Homo-oligomer: A and B are copies of this chain.
Amino acid sequence: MESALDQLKQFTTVVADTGDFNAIDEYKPQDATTNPSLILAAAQMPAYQELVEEAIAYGKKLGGPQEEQIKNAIDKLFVLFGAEILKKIPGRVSTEVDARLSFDKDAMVARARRLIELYKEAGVGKDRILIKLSSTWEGIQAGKELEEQHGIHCNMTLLFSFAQAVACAEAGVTLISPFVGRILDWHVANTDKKSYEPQGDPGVKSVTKIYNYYKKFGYKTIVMGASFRNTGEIKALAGCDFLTISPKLLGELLKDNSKLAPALSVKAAQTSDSEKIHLDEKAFRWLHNEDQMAVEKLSDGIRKFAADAIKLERMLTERMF
């Protein structure tokens, strides 16, 4: 008698969505993911103050104006959590670039390369890292550049529209994190339907559509559903390549013993009604704009993560100067 979590692993690679690395091992995941918000929350926990202190000391030691010291400390902090996480898992860890760079391709490429150098400085090879980038047109092209010119593997996040998914596939990025929960959020707030059956959940439908397109046309980019509101959405996506889940929902799955069966499959994808398209910049911007939810959620997701960066740098600034 296996838990829903153990069954899910038979059809999908499980990933833990958190910076709270002490809570990861209980769920024995393959990979783990962090983001500006998760790092901010973890950096505020007593259990991880030594990391914050080490980040602060690193920035101070290198010296320079506040801007320089803060950049060194916050990037070092992101890397320290990443390194501790890698010690708890056999796979990769995702680390996100400051969201304030989302519309600056060259800055994201540089920041991504910088994070990789810091990991190396910490004794971690790039093969165990996934750099997360906002899926704006600039972010996707940054990903294509990182992959093709530097062998730096990326995780394209805040992916809501089909246009973003297509752009990422064409970019040849290592992995994508199409959101589920925030899509449900939008529909509940912007439509008369406040509740859905698992397979009818708009976020579930989005990942399903993206998964089928990718598998049908043979794109190698890994599909990892992300952001969940309930276990129903997660179960409805079993069969998906990867799924990153919060410790809370992972706990629910570990306690649940009902039977699970995959809803997604490569074979079912090959017979789907997907139609291959190609998007240059202007085609992408138009198609993305046709998806109101995606426009608003990508935009808000960027503002929120930037706010988490600002808040984290403030917390550091008040302890460094």
List the interface of chain A (C-beta within 8 A of B).
100, 102-105, 136, 138, 281-282, 285-286, 289-290, 292, 295-296, 299-300, 302-303
Contact = CB atoms under 8 A, between A and B. Distances in A.
Contacts of A300: 292
A196 to B, nearest CB: 23
Contacts of A299: 289, 292, 295-296
B296 A104 contact: no
Chain multiplicity (copies): 2
Which 5 residue pairs of A and B lie closest in terms of their CB atoms, listed nearest first? A103-B285, A295-B299, A104-B282, A103-B282, A103-B286
A303 B296 CA distance: 13
A307 to B, nearest CB: 10
Contacts of A292: 299-300, 303
Nearest to A100: B286
Contact of A296 (B100, B282, B290, B295): B295
A150 B103 CA distance: 30
Contacts of A290: 303
Contacts of A302: 289
Nearest to A137: B285
A53 to B, nearest CB: 32
Contact of A289 (B105, B286, B303): B303
A296 B291 CA distance: 11
Given A102-B286, A105-B282, 5 more contacts: A104-B282, A138-B285, A289-B299, A292-B299, A295-B299
Contacts of A105: 282
A282 B104 CA distance: 6
A138 B285 CA distance: 10
A168 to B, nearest CB: 18
A25 to B, nearest CB: 38
Contacts of A103: 281-282, 285-286, 289
A103 B302 CA distance: 21
B303 A138 contact: no
A295 B303 CA distance: 12
Nearest to A286: B103
B100 A282 contact: no
A102 B286 CA distance: 8
20 contacts: A102-B286, A102-B289, A103-B281, A103-B282, A103-B286, A104-B282, A105-B282, A136-B285, A138-B282, A138-B285, A289-B299, A289-B302, A289-B303, A290-B303, A292-B299, A292-B300, A295-B296, A295-B299, A296-B296, A296-B299
Contacts of A285: 103, 136, 138
A228 to B, nearest CB: 24
A138 to B, nearest CB: 7
Contacts of A138: 282, 285
